[PDB]
């Protein structure tokens, strides 16, 4: 019956962005009221959020993860940067909403929370909604790395290390990306209407 957005937004644990989680939302009635009551980011693309309770979609996805505050702006169509290019990429024609909030109180700890990782290097940009969880050594220079770290040869994931005294641009933010897809197929995820 009611779509389980609470399992996504109020999950006690969130994914590392390089291993970002997707929840598919389907065969359910979607109450979007919680969006209008809190969030530090709430941007939508191609859809008016106050209309969602009167709209139907064929697929709805909720993608979630943790990044730094000053990276939230990269979660938008058209953006570039290590997160948009190497970790989580939206398509140019994204239709949906990007929601984030400061999670310093849960995701940082004294001495540092290193549990959250991101991909610092990649040979090419991700395609939209691509996920890369590989751990090959990254060749930054002319010399082949032969699988071994060294000058110009780097392990590709890095830990954020969130400390509660970080400046707010470096604190952890939880992000949910809602995709509303209107496809050539019956639109069976509707609001109450």
């Amino acid at each position, epitope marked *: 019956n009611l779509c389980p957005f609470g399992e996504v937004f109020n999950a006690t644990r969130f994914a590392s962005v390089y291993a970002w989680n997707r929840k598919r939302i389907s065969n359910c009635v979607a109450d979007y009221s919680f969006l209008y009551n809190s969030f530090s980011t709430f941007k939508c693309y*191609g859809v008016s959020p106050t209309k969602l309770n009167d709209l139907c979609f064929t697929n709805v996805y909720a993608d979630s993860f943790v990044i730094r505050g000053d990276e939230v702006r990269q979660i938008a169509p058209g953006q570039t940067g290590k997160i948009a290019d190497y970790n989580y990429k939206l398509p140019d024609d994204f239709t949906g909403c990007v929601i984030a909030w400061n999670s310093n109180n849960l995701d940082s700890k004294v001495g540092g929370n290193y549990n959250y990782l991101y991909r610092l290097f990649r040979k090419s940009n991700l395609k939209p909604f691509e996920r890369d969880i590989s751990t090959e050594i990254y060749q930054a220079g002319s010399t082949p790395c032969n699988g071994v770290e060294g000058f110009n040869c780097y392990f590709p994931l890095q830990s954020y290390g969130f400390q509660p005294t970080n400046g707010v641009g470096y604190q952890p933010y939880r992000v949910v990306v809602l995709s509303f897809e209107l496809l050539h197929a019956p639109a069976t995820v509707c609001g109450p209407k």
Partner: nanobody
Amino acid sequence: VQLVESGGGLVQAGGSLRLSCAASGRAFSRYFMGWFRQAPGKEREFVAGISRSGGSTDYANFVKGRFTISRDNAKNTVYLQMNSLKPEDTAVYYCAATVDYSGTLTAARGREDYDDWGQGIQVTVSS
């Protein structure tokens, strides 16, 4: 880019007011524009938003049809017409701008979604 607000002031409950916010520069048709309010003892909260062409508007749940956001790109100005004002609406009102890089931004409500702010104008609705 500098944003400069005008209008506002004191008004009797049930009355109306218009705020405006004029932007410097030549990039104004690129901007999604928002209005925010900051009332005594609360953080800044979203009121209304408008897409760069004026095709899409977006209102907080407390607007209840009472306010209209509009823009005139040829005057670099966004407006907030506020009707049927309540004392609950007393607050410092801010203008804000964010660049619609993808050309598809239809809402922006977070404090951290905007990079340029107007100076704030006090609006006071008396009982």
